């Protein structure tokens, strides 16, 4: 597969797939293509995306087994508004825990930058304003700086991810066993 909303083989996740996802959104000022590869050994089940800013029409891919990746996208709210796309995706995992992913693609790059983060929480925790504040303000998010960043997640897992710095953003994340 190759479109936002699909669950594909994990090895198939890569730039060309995401670039096509990003271009499919068309001419909007702020948008993001997200790909997350599950090599965690756990099965993931979608909970929700909390949009602090912006929106998506993509059904969050529901079941993402080990060895599979999900494709997703988001974009700024329609019309002459000076806002970007900022949100948190939450998946529950078969171990009873939650994988949380932050993305932030701001409107005003004079003041703000691209950011992302990945965290595992114990228990099933839906994405919400509180989780957004935790991931963005308190939990040392990574900059969308055209670099790869890796970090242990606890619970026997680790994350590695890459995000560019512009308003047409690509975020690629791989979750693996630590």
Curated annotation (Swiss-Prot):
Gene3D superfamilies reported for this sequence: Cytolysin/lectin (2.60.270.20)
GO-annotated cellular components: extracellular region; nematocyst; other organism cell membrane; pore complex
Residue numbers spanned by region N-terminal alpha-helix that contributes to the pore: 1-28
Chain span(s) of sequence motif Cell attachment site, crucial for protein stability: 143-145
Effect of residue 7 to C: In V8C/K69C; loss of ability to form stable pores after addition of a new disulfide bond
Binding residues annotated for an N-(acyl)-sphingosylphosphocholine 4, in chain numbering: 132, 137
GO BP annotations, alphabetical order: cytolysis in another organism; monoatomic cation transport; pore complex assembly
Annotated thermal dependence: Stable up to about 53 degrees Celsius.
Main location: secreted
Any further remark recorded for this protein: This protein has been found to bind carbohydrates, since it shows a substantial delay in elution profile in size-exclusion chromatography. The carbohydrate pocket ovelaps with the lipid-binding module of actinoporins.
Domain remark text: Composed of a long N-terminal alpha-helix and a core region rich in beta-sheet structures. Before the pore formation, the alpha-helix binds the lipid membrane, partitions into the lipid-water interface and stabilizes the monomeric molecule on the membrane. Finally, it traverses the bilayer, thus forming the transmembrane pore.
Quaternary data: Octamer or nonamer in membranes. Monomer in the soluble state.
Listed name of the protein: DELTA-actitoxin-Afr1a
Keywords of this entry: Cytolysis, Ion transport, Lipid-binding, Membrane, Nematocyst, Secreted, Target cell membrane, Target membrane, Toxin, Transmembrane, Transport
Binding site for an N-(acyl)-sphingosylphosphocholine 3: 115, 136
Pfam families membership: Anemone_cytotox (PF06369)
Applied biotechnology uses: Has been engineered for DNA analysis in nanopore technology.
Compartments (UniProt record): Secreted; Nematocyst; Target cell membrane
Effect of residue 148 to A: In V60E/W149A; decrease in hemolytic activity, suggesting that this mutant forms functional but structurally weak pores
Positions of N-acetyl-D-glucosamine 6-sulfate binding: 50, 52, 137
């Amino acid at each position: 597969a190759d479109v936002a909303g699909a669950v594909i083989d994990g090895a198939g996740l890569g730039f060309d797939v995401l670039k096509t996802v990003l271009e499919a959104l068309g001419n909007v000022k702020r948008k993001i293509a997200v790909g997350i590869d599950n090599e965690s050994g756990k099965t993931w089940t979608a909970m929700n995306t909390y949009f602090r800013s912006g929106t998506s029409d993509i059904v969050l891919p529901h079941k993402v087994a080990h060895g599979k990746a999900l494709l997703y996208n988001g974009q700024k709210n329609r019309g002459p508004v000076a806002t970007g796309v900022v949100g948190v995706i939450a998946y529950s995992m078969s171990d009873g825990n939650t994988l949380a992913v932050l993305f932030s693609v701001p409107y005003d790059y004079n003041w703000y930058s691209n950011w992302w983060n990945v965290r595992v929480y114990k228990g099933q925790k839906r994405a919400d304003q509180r989780m957004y504040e935790e991931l963005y303000y308190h939990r040392s998010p990574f900059r969308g700086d055209n670099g790869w960043h890796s970090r242990g997640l606890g619970y026997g897992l680790k994350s590695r991810g890459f995000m560019n710095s512009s308003g047409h953003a690509i975020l690629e994340i791989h979750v693996t066993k630590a």
